[PDB]
Amino acid sequence: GSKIEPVVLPLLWFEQSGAMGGKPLSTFYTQLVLMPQVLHYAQYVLLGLGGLLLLVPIICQLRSQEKCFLFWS
Numbered sequence: 001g002s003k004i005e006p007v008v009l010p011l012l013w014f015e016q017s018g019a020m021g022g023k024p025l026s027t028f029y030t031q032l033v034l035m036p037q038v039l040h041y042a043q044y045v046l047l048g049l050g051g052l053l054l055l056v057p058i059i060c061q062l063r064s065q066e067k068c069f070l071f072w073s
Contacts, residue, residue: 032038
């Protein structure tokens with residue numbers, strides 16, 4: 001109905017103060033790029049990159065499991 005329309009206004013306005021101690025995630029991404037808080041996420045990035053990095057040496061392990069000599073230089 002229309003009765004709750006002016007009611008959500010101050011409610012959002014409190015979110016703008018951070019009165020709920022949180023806002024939608026979309027808003028944070030733009031702060032993260034500049035603010036030290038990104039380092040905590042950088043840890044997560046490092047974990048992901050690290051786990052993905054594991055594939056890299058393994059590829060070479062496979063190149064060694066291929067066993068070649070003629071084209072092996």
